[PDB]
């Protein structure tokens, strides 16, 4: 019943969460592999 | 068997999550270099 469809009302949260907190990592490793670039640049303009 | 799904989807979340918060702890750490330098 209501039991049955919660479940599936879970998984899906579930993996809308996986999904949110894969894509969110992805977009700080961005962050972060450009903030080195920058430290890069700025260490080769010595 | 259901919750073998539940608790996968449950634990991959937490991994993501432990994950997520390290690689901002790198970023912030970055940034302040950053400051450190062109301050």
Same mark, same amino acid.
């Given at each position: 019943?209501?039991?049955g469809?919660?479940?599936e009302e879970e998984m899906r949260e579930?993996?809308?969460q996986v999904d949110q907190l894969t894509n969110? !990592?992805?977009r700080?490793?961005?962050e972060?592999?450009?903030l080195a670039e920058d430290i890069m640049r700025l260490?080769? !303009?010595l």
């Open positions: 019943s209501r039991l469809d919660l479940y579930l993996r809308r969110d !990592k992805a700080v490793e961005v972060r592999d450009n260490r080769e !303009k």
